[PDB]
Amino acid sequence: GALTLGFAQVGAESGWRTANTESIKSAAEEAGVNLKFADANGEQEKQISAIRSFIQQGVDVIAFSPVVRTGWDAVLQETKNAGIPVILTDRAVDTQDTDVYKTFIGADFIEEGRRAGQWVADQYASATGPVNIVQLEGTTGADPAIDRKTGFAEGISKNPNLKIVASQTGDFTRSGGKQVMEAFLKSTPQIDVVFAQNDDMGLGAMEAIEAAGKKPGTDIKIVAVDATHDGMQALADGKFNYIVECNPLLGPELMDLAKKVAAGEPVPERVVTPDEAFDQAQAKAALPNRQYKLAAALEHHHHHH
Numbered sequence: 001g002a003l004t005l006g007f008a009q010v011g012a013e014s015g016w017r018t019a020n021t022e023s024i025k026s027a028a029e030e031a032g033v034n035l036k037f038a039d040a041n042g043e044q045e046k047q048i049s050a051i052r053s054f055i056q057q058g059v060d061v062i063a064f065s066p067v068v069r070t071g072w073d074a075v076l077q078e079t080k081n082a083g084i085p086v087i088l089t090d091r092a093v094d095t096q097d098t099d100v101y102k103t104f105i106g107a108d109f110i111e112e113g114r115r116a117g118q119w120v121a122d123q124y125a126s127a128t129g130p131v132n133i134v135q136l137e138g139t140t141g142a143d144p145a146i147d148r149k150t151g152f153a154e155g156i157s158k159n160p161n162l163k164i165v166a167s168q169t170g171d172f173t174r175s176g177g178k179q180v181m182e183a184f185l186k187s188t189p190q191i192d193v194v195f196a197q198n199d200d201m202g203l204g205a206m207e208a209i210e211a212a213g214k215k216p217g218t219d220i221k222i223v224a225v226d227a228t229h230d231g232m233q234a235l236a237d238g239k240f241n242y243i244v245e246c247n248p249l250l251g252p253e254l255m256d257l258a259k260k261v262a263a264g265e266p267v268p269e270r271v272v273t274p275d276e277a278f279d280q281a282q283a284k285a286a287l288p289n290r291q292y293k294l295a296a297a298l299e300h301h302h303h304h305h
């Protein structure tokens with residue numbers, strides 16, 4: 001007889017996601033929250049069905065990661081009508097209604113993108129010729145994909161030699177990143193750098209660079225967002241060049257907010273998780289007690305009131 005939480009996950013498309021799923025499950029047990037976890041498997045209709053199912057179960061609070069910004073109108077009005085508060089985690093919505101969710105816990109995707117773009121720009125400062133950028137876009141319609149594109153675009157904007165000569169969705173998967181990169185290796189001859197919006201896509205792209213007998217991290221540079229275990233290991237080994245952290249360990253704050261919310265306590269409208277970036281040497285030093293350092297970084301989150 002404790003707080004009942006219903007979480008509707010996107011799927012398990014990346015390492016970041018699988019880390020997030022573990023953080024949400026583990027944090028619920030330690031907080032003593034009755035979690036009703038649901039895996040949509042990368043399809044919005046199954047997140048919608050899961051949200052509708054949580055109302056019929058009579059849960060105290062609902063939380064989910066909006067796979068894509070649009071198509072939640074009705075489900076959020078059903079929750080507002082049912083009186084179940086809503087918390088958005090790691091992805092935002094595009095809603096035409098007033099007070100449909102309590103707060104959004106996530107990172108500043110535009111700055112994750114800007115920081116990545118400004119690194120490419122800082123590296124190719126003395127370039128006397130053009131520098132060819134390739135871009136592996138995340139799931140079409142997802143809040144981080146749009147924002148990271150817009151951000152990266154701005155970081156690049158202050159250097160005319162940088163040109164995104166190609167850009168295409170890789171669905172935030174390793175397989176998806178491989179396909180699009182092998183397809184780019186055909187269509188584009190000169191590729192200086194690839195900007196993966198999720199290091200799983202950049203890992204698939206790294207396999208495709210190796211498969212086409214080219215040295216990733218030397219011949220073609222890779223810069224990605226997330227800083228997963230595998231992503232961070234590649235950077236530490238020299239296969240990647242720059243990584244911008246997106247912290248998956250929301251579990252603990254998601255519970256704290258779920259309890260505050262459920263008891264009618266005001267919570268800030270935004271909870272922005274921090275970010276940092278690593279070159280190769282930094283990746284080496286950052287790998288050791290990683291999950292402790294990440295949990296420490298989240299306690300330094302900030303609000304927008």
Ligand SMILES: OC[C@@H](O)[C@@H]1O[C@@H](O)[C@H](O)[C@H]1O
Nearest residue numbers: 014016090091144172198246
């Ligand atoms: O907040 C970001 C999160 O929603 C994104 O989802 C994951 O697909 C991807 O790796 C990650 O960047």
Ligand SMILES: [Zn+2]
Nearest residue numbers: 022023025026
């Ligand atoms: Zn576990």
Ligand SMILES: [Zn+2]
Nearest residue numbers: 073077096097
């Ligand atoms: Zn409406």
Ligand SMILES: [Zn+2]
Nearest residue numbers: 098099269305
């Ligand atoms: Zn308001």
Ligand SMILES: [Zn+2]
Nearest residue numbers: 092109143147
């Ligand atoms: Zn956004």
Ligand SMILES: [Zn+2]
Nearest residue numbers: 015228229230
């Ligand atoms: Zn691992």
Ligand SMILES: [Zn+2]
Nearest residue numbers: 245276294297
């Ligand atoms: Zn960190």
Ligand SMILES: [Zn+2]
Nearest residue numbers: 271301302303
């Ligand atoms: Zn706080």
Ligand SMILES: [Zn+2]
Nearest residue numbers: 268302303305
């Ligand atoms: Zn505050």
Ligand SMILES: [Zn+2]
Nearest residue numbers: 272302303304
């Ligand atoms: Zn801020």
